[PDB]
Design a protein around this nucleic acid. Structure first.
Ligand SMILES: [Mg+2]
Lengths: 184, 186
DNA sequence: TAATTTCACACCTAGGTGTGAAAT
DNA sequence: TAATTTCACACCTAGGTGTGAAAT
């Protein structure tokens, strides 16, 4: 049975315990931590296509009040979510199992008319990253193939235009090399 | 049915290098070409899917030497390695998509490491090379070994690979035109 | 309306330049 | 052999960070 392992799980757990937030911007923001995985148990010679997308975790809009995230009401409408085909697809099980799998092109935006293929999200809504394995050797075969979808609830997050919980901001500062200029 | 037209971008700059005898530095870690090979396509079927590619092949079977300020054939070429065929990352894509932007392979890299495992283009120093652009009307990467390639040659992009510039006039053009080298501008 | 969104900044990482001289 | 290949370096490009004041 193919199995998927989340990389840097201890760090995802630290963020998740405090309520993960991801900033979104018109021009596109990277996710931090990045969503990275390792696959095992794939048939070595069979061909697979690896993909990832982000979907709404529920149909609620949230607000951060009294130091907590709470559902404020029903969610705004959602845009179709970019499905990313990993650039090495299709590749053999062997090939996929010898590398950490990540999606470098992924970026989050709040611009609903974005034309860059970014993942479009509603600020103050909750999202769940999903990883997919499809046993097929033709990208065009994707609309007729079964997707095995791997969910890691510890990577769930609320999208925001600016951080709400300072404890999340501190973890981002202390762990993302690009933000080290703000470290004490 | 289409009627492709391939236009070389920044030809004026390519001509300036070509008139002096273009050289491209190659390194173990991989070196970008400058000028980068960029083109614009017209005449594609707007809806059809195309795969666009590029590779660099030997321009002849000679080894060169730069002496008395001139490039001259020194003898027969050394054996060559297979050459990374670059599939443009945006591939596959519709004809309309392709015609809506300059097609650049500025990320392709040149190396002298015959054991390279990065997919870089492997060249022999002091040998002459010709970049090639290819258009494939096919909607899947796996059908390339069997698909028909239309190949476009631009002789003005021919260059000799080196590990260090030989002709100081070429070094000056690289300095004066490549933003990454502007620190060396007068 | 209060909250949320935007933007110019000063840093940060990653990595593309030819140089000058050592190493082959 | 004498020329070619290598590499740390200063100086660059390119883009990823949160900040906090302004705008909505
Ligand atoms: Mg571990």
């Amino acid at each position: 049975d193919p199995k998927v392992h989340l990389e840097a799980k201890e760090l995802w757990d630290q963020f998740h315990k405090r309520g993960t937030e991801m900033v979104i911007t018109k021009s596109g923001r990277r996710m931090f931590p990045p969503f990275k995985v390792r696959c095992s148990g794939l048939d070595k010679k069979a061909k697979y296509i690896l993909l990832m997308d982000i979907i709404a975790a529920d149909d609620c809009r949230y607000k951060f009040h009294n130091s907590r995230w709470m559902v404020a009401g029903k969610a705004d409408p959602e845009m179709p979510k970019r499905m990313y085909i990993h650039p090495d697809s299709p590749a053999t099980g062997e090939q996929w199992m010898s590398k950490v799998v990540t999606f470098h092109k992924l970026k989050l935006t709040n611009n609903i008319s974005d034309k860059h293929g970014f993942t479009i999200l509603n600020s103050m809504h909750k999202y769940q990253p999903r990883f997919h394995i499809v046993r097929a050797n033709d990208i065009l075969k994707l609309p007729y193939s079964t997707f095995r979808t791997y969910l890691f609830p510890e990577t769930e997050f609320i999208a925001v235009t600016a951080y709400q919980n300072d404890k999340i901001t501190q973890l981002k500062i202390d762990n993302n090399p690009f933000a080290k200029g703000f470290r004490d």
